[model samples]
Target: VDPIADMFSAIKNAIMRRDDFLYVPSSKLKERILDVLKKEGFIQDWEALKGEKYEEEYKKMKELAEKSPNPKMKRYLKQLEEYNKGTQYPIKIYLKYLDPKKRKSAITNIVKVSKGGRRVYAGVRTMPYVKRGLGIAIVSTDAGVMTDHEARRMRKGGEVIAFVW
Candidate 1:
């Protein structure tokens, strides 16, 4: 499975539900993409959960799963357990909101542009401007993961990872 795509889906769903934070299985690529997201203001901030913090969050989730009747919470608890088992550490992403009253997320949408079977590559000239420059495109370039503006400025592009608006 595509971990990056899965992470995006999880974040999107969380934002739709107005969740304050999300826990994701971490990877090098995922961290890089998250860094881009933070820079682009799509997310407030994120941190790698380890040691005490990880244990505390995990315990809290388990407790909530036991006490609450929400199936989603139970699902999240299971996912968190699986991720901790597999990776030992997960990333906690703090989502950003634009309107507190309406719970409008800073990230309106995230569309994955590249995948294992079909990769979408672009050059500086052909790179897309998401939402006519209102949104930002996350691109994996030779240098690193960066925003579309950075890629255009450097005149370098690789795989377009996702579009965030």
Candidate 2:
């Protein structure tokens, strides 16, 4: 009965019938963001958008992966290639740009504040670690990507950081 839910259901149906498009752009990260959004159904069909420009997406992603200063990111790309080699999917990497304060703050909440507060309402303790000197980050789920907040939240639960490179 909810119109919003109906809209979402219709959108999801359309996306499910399509593709999951992923890509990277040297000049416009917005393009990649849009591509991800489309694939994820923020703007368009999520499933219908995938695998449409897969090769191009992989190529651009690989190029950026090669140029990445973060060793862990580079290694993750390599792992994707090595582990998922020969698969139709090309290696994918997601980047999060976190300011030092925000990054540190997230880490602090996870590592030092276990009792829960405005920062972490989910009651998850944080375990802080550094990756490629990009301040503190976390990788605990199967999402295949890392984020400042996600890492901190995951860290609160005593998950060890898995270094790739």
Candidate 3:
């Protein structure tokens, strides 16, 4: 019911549909979740929306910036303009594949630990090493959004967001 769960569900469905990329809405929480997915090796990469209409234009701008006679200044401005400024909604995520020829993805599944109707919290010792460390337990701690491994290192913990393996 929560956006967090919806995002994970989106990933699962995208994987099931065999798409290399998928679009989902964004926010700071979702941003951090994407960071965790990227950090834990669940996804290849992610960035802000590139609407269909803007796709070609953006490509052209990028190409021009790369080959411009002046070279660097315009590229700097372009990057600055793109950073943290999104007039669009979703983020494009690049899903990773473990065995592309065999249709195997690196991310197996996503399970939301804390439900809408219930809250789940854990201390460092109480939090588990997801999939015996093969997977990741993404926790939202006061310190920040981090994996259970980091939670342990910092000796902190909080609500268990999701389990990814």
Candidate 4:
């Protein structure tokens, strides 16, 4: 599986499971995309971990699992355990919810725009708005990866990465 695809799936699955955090195997592109996600408030924050930090997070998760009785937490713990086994420099992503009452995910949907076979490139004039401005489209431009709003402000555009709403 491609790293971007895997990262997308991991976040989607975590939201489906109502998980607060997700562990993703890291890459430079993933980091950049995550930065966009955080900036757009789709996610709370993300941390990149190396050997000792990784081990500390694993231990903390293990401790939490031992004390928590919530089924969702257990499931998250299991997923993290499996993730810890094969991954290095894993990224810990804190998710954001729409509200406290409903606990709905801030991200209603995420659609990958530019794909491997058919890349979707755009210019400033042609850049698409996601969900009529309710959502943000992540675009990779010459400067860096940024939200559609940022791209529009800068009057720059490149390959559309994904739409998040």
Residue 108 lDDT in model 3?
87
Evaluated with lDDT, which candidate comes out highest?
1
**TM-score of every model versus the real structure:** 0.87, 0.24, 0.75, 0.83
Candidate 3 minimal-lDDT segment of 10 residues? 75-84
**Candidate 4 — which pairs collide?**
108-165
What is the TM-score of candidate 2? 0.24
Cα misplacement distance, residue 41 of candidate 1 (Å)? 1.0
* Deviating ranges (above 4 Å) for candidate 3: 50-88
State residue 159's C-alpha deviation in candidate 4, in Å. 0.6
- Model 4 worst lDDT run, 10 consecutive residues: 79-88
Please provide, for model 4 over 124-146, each residue's C-alpha lDDT reduced to its tens digit, 9 standing for 90 to 100.
Answer: 89989988899988899999999
Per-candidate local distance difference test: 0.87, 0.34, 0.77, 0.82
Clashing pairs in 3: none
- Over the stretch 91-158, how does candidate 3's per-residue lDDT look in tens digits? 66899988866289888888999887788888878988887898888899998899988999999979
Q: Sorted by lDDT, highest first, which candidate order results?
A: 1, 4, 3, 2
